[PDB]
A paper describes a structure:
Na+/H+ exchangers (NHEs) are ancient membrane‐bound nanomachines that work to regulate intracellular pH, sodium levels and cell volume. Here, we report the cryogenic electron microscopy structure of NHE isoform 9 ([name]) from [name] at 3.2 Å resolution, an endosomal isoform highly expressed in the brain and associated with autism spectrum (ASD) and attention deficit hyperactivity (ADHD) disorders. Despite low sequence identity, the [name] architecture and ion‐binding site are remarkably similar to distantly related bacterial Na+/H+ antiporters with 13 transmembrane segments. The [name] monomer consists of 13 TMs with an extracellular N‐terminus and intracellular C‐terminus.
Surprisingly, there was no obvious density for any of the 90‐residue long C‐terminal tail regulatory domain (CTD), likely a result of its predicted dynamics and intrinsic disorder. We repeated cryo‐EM structural determination for a horse [name] construct lacking the entire CTD domain ([name] ΔCTD), which displayed similar kinetics as the close‐to‐full‐length [name]* construct. Consistent with removal of the entire flexible CTD, 36% of the auto‐picked particles now contributed to the final 3D class with an improved EM map resolution of 3.2 Å (and EV2B and EV3). After several rounds of refinement with global and local search using ctf refine and polishing, a final resolution of 3.19 Å was achieved at gold‐standard FSC (0.143), with a local resolution range of 3.1–4.1 Å. As model building revealed only minor differences between [name]* and [name] ΔCTD structures, the later was used for all subsequent analysis due to its moderately better resolution. Superimposition of [name]* (wheat) and [name] ΔCTD (core transport domains (blue), dimerization domains (orange), linker helices (grey)) structures, which show only small differences in the most mobile regions. Cryo‐EM density map of the [name] ΔCTD homodimer with the 6‐TM core transport domains (coloured in blue), the dimer domain (coloured in orange) and the linker helix (coloured in grey). In NhaA, with 12 TMs, the dimerization interface is instead formed by interactions between an antiparallel β‐hairpin extension in a loop domain that buries a total surface area of only ~ 700 Å2 (Lee et al, 2014). In [name], the substrate‐binding cavity is located between the dimer and core ion‐transport domains and is open towards the intracellular side. In [name], the end of TM3 was observed to have moved away from the dimerization interface, exposing a hydrophobic pocket for lipids between the protomers, reminiscent of lipid binding in PaNhaP at active pH and the more distantly related citrate transporter CitS (Wohlert et al, 2014; Xu et al, 2020; Fig EV4A).
Author numbering:
A (entry chain B): 23 to 49, 54 to 68, 123 to 189, 199 to 259, 269 to 422, 428 to 488
B (entry chain A): 23 to 49, 54 to 68, 123 to 189, 199 to 258, 269 to 422, 428 to 488
Amino acid sequence: ELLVFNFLLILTILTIWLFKNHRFRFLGAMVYGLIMGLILRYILEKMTFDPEIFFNVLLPPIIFHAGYSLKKRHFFQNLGSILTYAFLGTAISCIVIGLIMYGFVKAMVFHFTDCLFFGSLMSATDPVTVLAIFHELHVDPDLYTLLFGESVLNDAVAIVLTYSISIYSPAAFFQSVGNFLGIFAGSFAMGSAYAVVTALLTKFTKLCEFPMLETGLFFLLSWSAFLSAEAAGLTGIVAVLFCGVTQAHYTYNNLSLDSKMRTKQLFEFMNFLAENVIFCYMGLALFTFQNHIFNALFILGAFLAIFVARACNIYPLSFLLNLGPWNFQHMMMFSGLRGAIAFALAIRDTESQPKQMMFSTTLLLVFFTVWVFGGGTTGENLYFQ
Amino acid sequence: ELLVFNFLLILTILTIWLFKNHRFRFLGAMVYGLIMGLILRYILEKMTFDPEIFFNVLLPPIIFHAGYSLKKRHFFQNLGSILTYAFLGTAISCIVIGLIMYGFVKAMVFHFTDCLFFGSLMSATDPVTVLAIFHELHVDPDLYTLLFGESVLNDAVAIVLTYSISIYSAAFFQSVGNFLGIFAGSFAMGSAYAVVTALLTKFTKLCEFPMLETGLFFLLSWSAFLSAEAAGLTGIVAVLFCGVTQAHYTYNNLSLDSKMRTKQLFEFMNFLAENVIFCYMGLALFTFQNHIFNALFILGAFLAIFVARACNIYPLSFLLNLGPWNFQHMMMFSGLRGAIAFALAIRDTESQPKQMMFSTTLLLVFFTVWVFGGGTTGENLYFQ
C-alpha cells in the first residue's frame, strides 16, 4: 500500500484544478468515472485495500461539519417540517419495496428481507452539489435551510433503520422496532452527553486563554463520542457524531472567542476531503471486479420506482403540513440527489447474499444517472424561481 | 481494537488538564503514561497493537511543523554554525560505539556492527521541552534559534545514516555513497514538490480561492512523502523535511489568507505528538516479550550519555570561534534526547532474540533525561 495512497492525492490536484479553471463552465471529481477507469483496466487489487469497516470511520468527520455548520435559522422556522421528514425515511422504504418487490417477481414470470434492506438503503439523500449551487447564489434561504436539514436527518435515520432489517429473524417485528428506537435514542443521548461535557468544561474553567488547548480538547472530546459507540456495542456510529448539533449550540458560543473560526477551518478541511469518498464511488465500479459481476437487467425496475416513490411522498407529506404557506413551489425542487452515505451501506460485508452484490451494482448506476440533476440545477432554478 | 483507541483519548484528555494546571508549578505529561499501564497491568496486546510501519506514517506531521516554523532569522547569521553540526551525528556515533563496544566485551568476562546501529540511533536529539521554556520566558534569542537548528537536522541525519550501516556488511565506501545518495536525493525530490507548489501559487491567482489552495498545499506536501517511499528512496522522513523551502517561498508569495490556517493546521497535528510521547509506556509495560530484558548494561550506556554531548560540542564549537557566545551558551547545549529516536529502536524489534536489549535500554534513557529536562530553569539562571 505504498503508492496506492499517492494515486488518491495525485488525481486530487486535478480535481482541485478543475474547480478553479472550470469555475464558469456549463458543467468535480465525478467526471473521471468514465475516462479514467478504462485506461487502468489492465495494483488493481491493492487499490481495493479499501476496508468497509474503515470506510465508516472516515465518514463521521464528513458528517460532523454538516452538523457543525448549522446557522440556527431553522429551529423555529422549518424545524417542524424536518422532524416531519423523519417519517420520510420510513415513507421511502415502505414505498420502494412496494414496486421493487414485483420487479424480480415478474423477472421469473430469494426472500423479502433484503427487499426492505434495499428500500431503507436508498432513503439517504445528500445533494451536496445542489447545496453548493444554492450557497454560491446566496438566494432562497428558506429552501437552503429546509433542504439541508432534510439531507442530514434521513441518512441518520437510514443507517439506524437498515440495521434492524438486517437482524430481523422471526412476532419478532417489535424486536426490530425496539432495536431501532433503542439505538437511535442511545446514539442521541450518549452523543450529546459528550457535547454537554465539552460545553460545561469550557463554560466555567478559564481555559479559553490557550487557543490550542481548547482546540485539541474539542477534537478529542468530539471524536471520543464516536469512538465510544463501538466500544459499548451501540451501533449507528455515524448517527452518534451527527448528534453534535448541540456541540455547535453551546460549546462554540460559550467562551471560545478565538477558535470559533479555527474549529470550522480544521473541520471543514476534513470535509474538504469528501472527493475521496466521491472518488471511491467510481473506484468500486472497476477495481472491485467481483462486486459488479452481475450488472443484471434490474435497473429499469429500480429506475422507475426510485423517482415515483419520492414523488408520491413529498406532496402528501407537505399537504399535511400545509393544513397546520410554503409558496406551494418547493416540493418540485426537493427531488435532488440520492445520498452520499448510501454507497457505504451497499458495501456491508459485500457478499452476505447473492443479490447483495447487485444492490451495489444498481447503486453504482444511480450515481452515474442522478448526478445529471446537479448539472441541470441552474436551469431548473430559473425555471421555477 | 475498537475500544483500544478510546482508552488513548481519555489519557490524552488528561494531558490538556496537566498543561492547564502548570502555569506556576515548578515542573510534564510523562506521568500518566506510567500510571495508566499499572492500572491495566494490575486488553494487554490490543492496547499495544501499534504497527511498526504505522508509527512512521504518524510521525511526518511532527517533522513538518518543525521545518515550517523557521523564523528565517538564522540562515544569514548562524547558517554555517548549524551546518557544522551535520558532523555531530557522525561525531556522536564515532565515540558512542567505542564505549558500548567495551560495555559488553568486559561484561562477558554478537559483533561490533550492532554498535554502529546503537550509535547512529542515539545521535537524534529533539529537546522540545527546552524550546518551550525559552519561548515562554522570551529570552536568549540567539541561543533559541541555534538550539533549534541542529536539534531537528540531526534527526533526519540519524534516520538516513542508520539504514546504510544496518545493511552494511572495502564495503564501507558504498555505504557512505548510499547514505549520501539518499540524502542528496531527499533534497532534490523533497524540494521538487515545494518548487511546484511555489510556482503554482505565484503565477496562477489562487489568492481569490483560499478554500482551495490550502488543500493543494497539503496534498502536494503529503505527496512528497508518498512519492519517496513508493520510488524506493528511503529516509522518507527527511524527504518531507526538505519542504522547508515552502515557508521560504510558498508561505510568502500570494496566500495572504491561509498563512495562519496553514500554520495552525499542520501545528495541530504536531500537537498530537503526545501519542509518540505516550507510546513508550504503552510498549514499556504491556509488551512483556519486548522490555522484559532490562539487562544490567545501563551503566555502560549511561556513562556514554554525557561524554557524547561533551566530547563533540566543546571541540567543534571552539572551531567556530575562529571565524563571543559569552561562554555561557557553551555548556547549555546538553539538552534532552527528543522523541524521534523511539521509532528506530522499534524497527520490527526482532533482529535477534537477545539483541532487543537496545529497545529496553532506550526506554530508560527517556526517563533519566526527562528529569534532567525538568531542572532546566535552574541552569538558565545559573549561566545567564
